[PDB]
Amino acid sequence: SELKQAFVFEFDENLSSSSGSIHLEKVKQNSSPNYDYFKITFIDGYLYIKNKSGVILDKYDLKNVISLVALKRDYLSLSLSNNKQIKKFKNIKNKHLKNKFNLYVINEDIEKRITKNGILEEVILNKMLLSILLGNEENLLQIS
């Protein structure tokens, strides 16, 4: 009875952080035949914006935010996760991984639930999306 294709994410950085749960779905499209598109719907979670003092300045509810991302279909060549444990989408703080498959964000917030607050929020959501996905692309392999 669990939610299907739904996973926990954790994002930690100096000036922002986030955690919660996301639903991933493959998105049919013809604009970029060498890419797979994924829709990310936030089920639960908060986006935190912090000052340099580590003080939380703002807290944003991510619930029902819809994000759209894409990466090159070469990721399909990755070996499967070995059913090792439960798949999750976490970064490692200050570790900026190489972007092997040209993962990029098409739209970080389709209804501008958060990004209507300003440019800063846009940039932060974009960086968060890349951070929880890079290094974790094999998690996308049996996502339909």
TrEMBL record:
Keywords: Neurotoxin, Plasmid, Toxin. It comes from the Bacteria. This is Neurotoxin complex component Orf-X1. Pfam families: Orfx1. Residues 4-144 form the Orfx1 TULIPs domain. InterPro entries: Orfx1.
